[PDB]
Amino acid sequence: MQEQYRPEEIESKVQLHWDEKRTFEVTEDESKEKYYCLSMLPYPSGRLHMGHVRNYTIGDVIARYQRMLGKNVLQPIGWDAFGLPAEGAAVKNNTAPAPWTYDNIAYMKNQLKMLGFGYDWSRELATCTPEYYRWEQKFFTELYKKGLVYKKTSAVEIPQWFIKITAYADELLNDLDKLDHWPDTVKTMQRNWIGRSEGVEITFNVNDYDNTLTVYTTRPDTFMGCTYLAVAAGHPLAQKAAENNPELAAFIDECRNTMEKKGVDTGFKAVHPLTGEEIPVWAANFVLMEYGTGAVMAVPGHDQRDYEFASKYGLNIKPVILAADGSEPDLSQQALTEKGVLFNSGEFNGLDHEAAFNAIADKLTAMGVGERKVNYRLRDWGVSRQRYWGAPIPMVTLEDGTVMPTPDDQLPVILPEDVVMDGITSPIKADPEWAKTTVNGMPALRETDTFDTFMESSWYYARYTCPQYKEGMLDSEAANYWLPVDIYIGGIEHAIMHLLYFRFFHKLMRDAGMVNSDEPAKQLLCQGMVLADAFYYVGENGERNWVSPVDAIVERDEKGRIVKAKDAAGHELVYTGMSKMSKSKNNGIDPQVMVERYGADTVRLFMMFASPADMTLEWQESGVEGANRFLKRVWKLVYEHTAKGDVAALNVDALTENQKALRRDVHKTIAKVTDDIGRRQTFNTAIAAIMELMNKLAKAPTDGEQDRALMQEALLAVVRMLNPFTPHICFTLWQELKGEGDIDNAPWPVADEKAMVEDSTLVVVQVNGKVRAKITVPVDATEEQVRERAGQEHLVAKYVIYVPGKLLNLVVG
RNA sequence: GCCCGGAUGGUGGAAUCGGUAGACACAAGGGAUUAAAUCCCUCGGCGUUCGCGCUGUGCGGGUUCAAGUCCCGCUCCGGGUACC
């Protein structure tokens, strides 16, 4: 064994080993309990960022640990490889998106290997390869034939393919109650984004208008307070009136471009269905065209938005709901928003909210001018992009003008990778020959738009279970073996997009017979952002210039706080504190630099120690150095121990009191570390516990046979406890220690519960809650015996609650 | 304005159970060694007769025998949102 720990001589050899032995490749073994550990797959931008390293280290820790518990562990990796940045990069450079992407994949793949993440590399996927996207093309055609896909023009004013995610809204909402092991914050974000709403459509007659006008309200109980209607700028009733009306004309145009209320009177009168009175119809900026019918009824008395509109434009404010105490409401300043009993409403006077809502809804429904309507804030999923670098949409327009999917025997529709980008138009649109095809004996033009990249990331988790299956999108027996994902790790920024889509997609696959389960992932862990110090100076021109923390010459006060800072050019810098890493703040830290500086193990250890997985981590070079010194101390202790050669078998009966208590701490540490990693997922305190035992072990004597056999037990346990964090050093150390086999197949240490019996316990004696004594009594002892002993204590003598083997308190009388 | 988080030493963070506040580490000071590195110790605040005594978890309160933890106010900090 070398005296000095040198990661450059260890890590790349251990990584080769893992490749040659295929250590982390797994099959569908029914003789083992499966564990599927998944980290959000990276986009191949070119280099790993510190957020990748954190995400993937957390994942690797769990995967390695669960393997040592005896599970069959799937930890897959791959590339979300389509998307916008490759188009830009291709143009800036001399190239095309495909080769730029594959070059990045190779470079980033090597980085991941150099960090030593135990992936099953046999299951590696690149989502821009036909072998992957072909299946989402087939799936889309099936969705279309099942009526879940449609085309329409929308404004984000382009025609688009939509998938009917709203057909699954109720279930996506309801099934959140099954997600006990997802964080409340993500669940609440999904609830709010779905935005399920119960209400009533109310249809009106408009006097000089050809059509009826329909509005959506969540508050039909306020309908006798309706003094006008309001329509979106893009509503067709507004477009018609705008022909004669230049005031309205310019208002509509203004609303397309560039929380104040703004409106113009349309001139149209609508007939209130209950009263029969004419009310006016205004165009208003606060009514979204895309939600509900794009038209509301206005009740200024009780909708704050309608209050400010009516107050601005002089329209009537009419009170129809009473205040909580039953008194008529104060409308002189704002709307009365709370639900309450009706007045000023004829039939419906005296009805409380629920009764008013139903009575009015029922009356309108019976008159044929209302119906209950459930809307969602959730929009249908627009999946088409006017971009080249994405999977082609498998749809076609025959010369008929008729539209159908690309036939099965023409799938996949392959994106040609050999292209020159003019930077302006997609190559597959620019070449007019590419679109031309023949379908069903007929000439046709195939879709030129491509899928948004969310399409690929919505199902990769499942394809990892059968990456090479050629028969279908999924092999159901393999998918159901592995799914649902046990833990999914990745940032909270994905909560309302990817984290929703993949649930939807899971449910689509379920409903196609493809998978067995309702939800894709049991636990979601959102790891916190990595932060770094940020500095800037102000130039002579008044512009801020951000300076990398590496380049800051800082001056600290007596207590180590930064009190002044300069760069080498002499610029006075202002320290802005720990912040999110960015190219704009110029404070990003390159993990490759840190891996080459300290070794992958040091970087992994620091990232798992500095902070709880779900909280922000502050990058501190002094912290990384601390981690580096710790591993050197661990290396050092194994080097001195093994230098003394083989050890006798440990004899637990003949151990000394000192030896027994040291052993007890080894085993108590095994228990705590097991619980922190396995149940609490508090990795930072797990490492802390290992550090604390190491400090004790560095002081233990190692000359007697029994001392050396104990140390052997301890070090073999420590090397295993650390292995999920720092597997390169632990792989090597295990061998040095003559452990059986490769550490990766070694069993996780189990605490020997005979070694943990305490004999005595400490008890804190308090008088009026404040500690006066600390005393040692057996776990064996009865309540009297503990107070008897307490009473014999002389500082207790100068001055009744009991917790066994813990505390005794005396309220003074 | 809005929704959802959060506040413990010089710093990151511990305290899982309401029951010894500050584990572990960083920084700093003293020691061994010749600057650096590494290994030996001290380190919440105040007082101190150097043995300890008192105080302390943003500020108020409530429950309790006991609150960093549970409950309610207030202040301040962070993230998310755009008339659904």
Write a structural description.
By secondary structure, the protein is α+β, with helices and mostly antiparallel strands. Strands 7, 8, 9, 10, 11, 12 and 13 form a seven-stranded mixed beta sheet that branches. It has a four-stranded parallel beta sheet with strand order 2-1-21-22, covered by helices on one side. Strand 23 (530-538) and strand 24 (544-547) form a beta hairpin. The protein folds into five domains: 1-31 and 587-759, Isoleucyl-tRNA Synthetase, Domain 1 (Orthogonal Bundle), CATH 1.10.730; 32-195 and 376-531, Rossmann fold, CATH 3.40.50.620; 196-375, Isoleucyl-tRNA Synthetase, domain 2, CATH 3.90.740; 532-586, Rubrerythrin, domain 2, CATH 2.20.28; 760-813, Ubiquitin-like (UB roll) (Roll), CATH 3.10.20. The chain contains 26 helices and 32 strands. The two termini are 67 Å apart. 36% of the residues lie in helices and 19% in strands. It binds one RNA strand of 84 nucleotides through helix 7, strand 28, helix 20, helix 21 and helix 22. It is classed as ligase/rna. Keywords: ligase-RNA complex, ligase, protein biosynthesis, class I aminoacyl-TRNA synthetase, aminoacyl TRNA synthetase, ATP binding, editing synthetase. The assembly is dimeric. The entry is titled "Ternary complex of E .coli leucyl-tRNA synthetase, tRNA(Leu) and the benzoxaborole AN3213 in the editing conformation".
